[PDB]
């Protein structure tokens, strides 16, 4: 099943994008391996690590750190966050 729903665009998530990181809302019934494989297939960028959080609204946020510099900028460019 699909594990990425949409990028998260609050003010804190914008500042993460400076040092090459994003912040997705993922499906709450998923782990880090599935998130890794989904994002890697969907954008072809070799993810480095992943940090996960459960929020009090119910959803589940995930922060992806990429290896290739400037990757998060162009992912956010094509996705439409910019």
């Amino acid at each position: 099943m699909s594990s990425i729903n949409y990028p998260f665009v609050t003010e804190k998530a914008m500042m993460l994008l400076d040092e090459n990181k994003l912040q997705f809302i993922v499906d709450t019934r998923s782990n880090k391996k599935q998130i890794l494989e989904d994002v890697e297939k969907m954008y072809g960028f070799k993810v480095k690590s992943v940090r996960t959080m459960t929020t009090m609204k119910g959803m589940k946020k995930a922060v992806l750190a990429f290896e290739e510099p400037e990757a998060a900028h162009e992912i956010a460019t094509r996705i439409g966050l910019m």
Binding site: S2, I4, N5, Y6, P7, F8, V9, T10, I25, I79, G80, L81
Partner: protein, 67 residues
């Protein structure tokens, strides 16, 4: 009419259907991302139309044994 009717979905080839599916998923991701920041959507019918079209495509694939 709609983003796709059933006739066009059944007429296309397998790769054509899959590609339409990925295009629809990407557009839905962008639409949700924009609307998640507390903004009035530029066209708040797109989400419903997109989800219903994707449901059509998945139903057609499952009926044709594609998946």
């Amino acid at each position: 009419m709609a983003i796709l009717r059933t006739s066009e979905i059944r007429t296309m080839t397998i790769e054509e259907r899959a590609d339409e599916l990925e295009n629809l998923n990407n557009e839905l991701v962008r639409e949700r991302a924009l609307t998640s920041a507390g903004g009035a959507p530029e066209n708040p019918g797109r989400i419903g139309e997109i989800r219903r079209t994707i449901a059509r495509i998945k139903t057609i694939q499952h009926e044709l044994n594609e998946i």
